[PDB]
Amino acid sequence: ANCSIMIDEIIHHLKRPPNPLLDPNNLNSEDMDILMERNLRTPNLLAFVRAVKHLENASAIESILKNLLPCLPLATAAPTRHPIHIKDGDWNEFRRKLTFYLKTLENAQAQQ
């Protein structure tokens, strides 16, 4: 299989900013700690498969992330705080959240 390629490969489809708007599609400093917590990465995937349904033009991505849930490590196989929170479905929300997400995942998935 190639679960690792399914991660850095979506970063390719995660780089198309249209224009700056005033939409709520965005994460805060606390949400960043979520997508970064290796153990809290999969639960963000739960919010990535739900929001990607309302994310127009991201259905094929819902296929990747959903298949990526079991491809994540489990340092202390258990959650601690609430996971991420996407928006109505704007690529701007999944832009900062998902970019930093899939990236920190494959980064701590191997590391040397």
Residue ranges of domains in the chain, CATH in brackets: 1-112 (1.20.1250.10)
Instruction: For residue 72, give the amino acid letter.
Output: L
Residue 29 makes CB contacts below 8 A (sequence gap 6+) with none
Closest by CA position to 69, among listed 36, 43, 94, 103: 43
What is the end-to-end Cα distance of the chain in Å, rounded?
20
> After which residues does the chain have a break in its backbone, defined as C to next N over 2.5 Å?
none
The token pair at 4 is 């690792």
- CA distances (Å), origin 63, targets 37, 45, 81: 22, 11, 26
| Residue 99: count of CB within 10 angstroms of its CB | 15
CA distance 63 to 82: 23
Q: How was it solved?
A: NMR
| Residue 88: count of CB within 10 angstroms of its CB | 11
Closest by CA position to 48, among listed 17, 7, 4, 1: 7
CA distance 70 to 68: 6
- Which phi and psi (to 5°) does residue 19 adopt? -150, 160
C-beta of residue 109 within 8 angstroms of C-beta of residue 73 = yes
Sign (positive or negative) of CA dihedral 61, 50, 74, 93: positive
